Design a protein around this ligand. Structure first.
Ligand SMILES: CCCCCCCCCCCCCCCC(=O)NCC(=O)O
Ligand SMILES: [Cl-]
Ligand code: NA
Lengths: 98, 269
């Protein structure tokens, strides 16, 4: 189908209290309009940036969103995704692997 | 050395709040080298790759991109009715060229409408192929005018390869700089089973492989791969997971091969 396939991952291997970048990558979706929000404990993270709209060889669209952050062991990080193929927003939790 | 130049063009009736309706992203060997969008109306190099570019080259890139934007706008205002139309619509184009190791050339030129194949142009035979009877209309009009074929034979086989050679030379420092992955192996237990995840962070160039081994023998049968996905600094990320009984958790190695590693690396939990 054409719903977003979403991965959340940190730029570097994560460790508590060390500056890093949190990534949310959505791919395989259509149409290209899409909402992607990085959050810390349900709060939108500040300084987030999005890639220029682009697509895979099979024409499906994709977008990377990223923001600087300092992971805290106390916190939940996640990526909230809204798309026309989605009746409700989809929340993808980051698995820190501390 | 085999090398590639690719442009990814998107026009959109409904790109979303504050987003440009027409975008171009250019790639050299899976590195973004420049971009254009309908808000800035400017084609710009990625200075981390192309640090010392002349304005005149990018003046040219800008005007060609603005023409592409006009053409996408023209088509988006015609194809929906022709296909019979009511929702949002998209138009896409991918074109470029390859220079094979022996110096021979390949051109690519493909279009899609609402995310489905629409039209392709084959440089070596100078022929079009239409994806359906509606696209066939545009095919016949373009071949009968007899202008597109010669322009894009030139565009793909001459201009693209020249620009590829220029980007390869101007961006050689960034293009050749190998970045070793930082590999993290993790394991989490749930419902009594241990999922082992091998994550490779921040490698360049893009090609990588990741395998899971037990007692030195490969175990592909129960491995899931997440795919190679981008970081924002032009490096990449890739992952592999495998489920195993918590008793045998010390017995698995993930094997990472990457051009930055003289020998494949073995990592455990
Ligand atoms: C580095 C990214 C920004 C610079 C990109 C350079 C711009 C090149 C794009 C021009 C291609 C647009 C043509 C697409 C529509 C079309 O088929 N028109 C008919 C035709 O051009 O013959
Ligand atoms: Cl180890
Ligand atoms: Na716009």
């Amino acid at each position: 189908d054409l719903t977003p396939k979403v991965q959340v991952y940190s730029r570097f291997p994560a460790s508590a209290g060390t500056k890093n970048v949190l990534n949310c990558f959505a791919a395989g979706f259509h149409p290209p309009k899409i909402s992607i929000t990085l959050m810390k404990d349900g709060v939108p993270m500040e300084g987030a940036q999005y890639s220029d709209m682009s697509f895979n060889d099979d024409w499906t669209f994709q977008r990377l969103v990223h923001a600087d952050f300092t992971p805290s062991s106390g916190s939940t990080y996640a990526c909230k995704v809204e798309h026309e193929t989605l009746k409700e927003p989809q929340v993808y939790k980051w698995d820190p692997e501390f | 050395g085999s090398h590639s130049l690719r442009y990814f063009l998107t026009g959109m009736t409904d790109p979303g709040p504050g987003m440009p309706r027409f975008v171009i992203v250019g790639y050299v060997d899976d590195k973004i080298f420049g971009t254009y969008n309908s808000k800035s109306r400017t084609a710009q190099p990625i200075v981390e790759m192309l640090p010392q570019e002349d304005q005149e080259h990018w003046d040219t890139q800008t005007q060609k991109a603005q023409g592409g934007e006009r053409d996408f706008d023209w088509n988006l205002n015609r194809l929906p009715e022709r296909y019979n139309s009511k929702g949002s619509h998209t138009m896409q184009m991918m074109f470029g060229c390859d220079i094979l190791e022996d110096g021979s050339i390949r051109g690519y030129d493909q279009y899609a409408f609402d995310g489905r194949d629409f039209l392709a142009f084959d440089m070596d035979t100078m022929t079009f192929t239409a994806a359906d009877p509606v696209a066939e209309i545009t095919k016949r009009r373009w071949e009968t005018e007899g202008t597109y074929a010669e322009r894009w034979k030139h565009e793909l086989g001459t201009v693209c390869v020249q620009n590829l050679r220029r980007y390869l030379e101007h961006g050689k420092a960034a293009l050749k700089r190998r970045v070793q992955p930082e590999v993290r192996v993790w394991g989490k237990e749930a419902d009594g089973i241990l999922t082992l995840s091998c994550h490779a962070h921040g490698f360049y160039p893009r090609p990588i492989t990741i395998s899971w081994m037990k007692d030195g023998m490969v175990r592909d049968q129960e491995t899931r791969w997440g795919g190679i996905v981008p970081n924002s600094d032009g490096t990449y990320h890739a992952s592999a997971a495998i489920d195993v009984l918590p008793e045998d958790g010390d017995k698995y190695w993930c094997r990472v091969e990457h051009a930055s590693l003289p020998q494949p690396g073995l990592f455990s939990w």
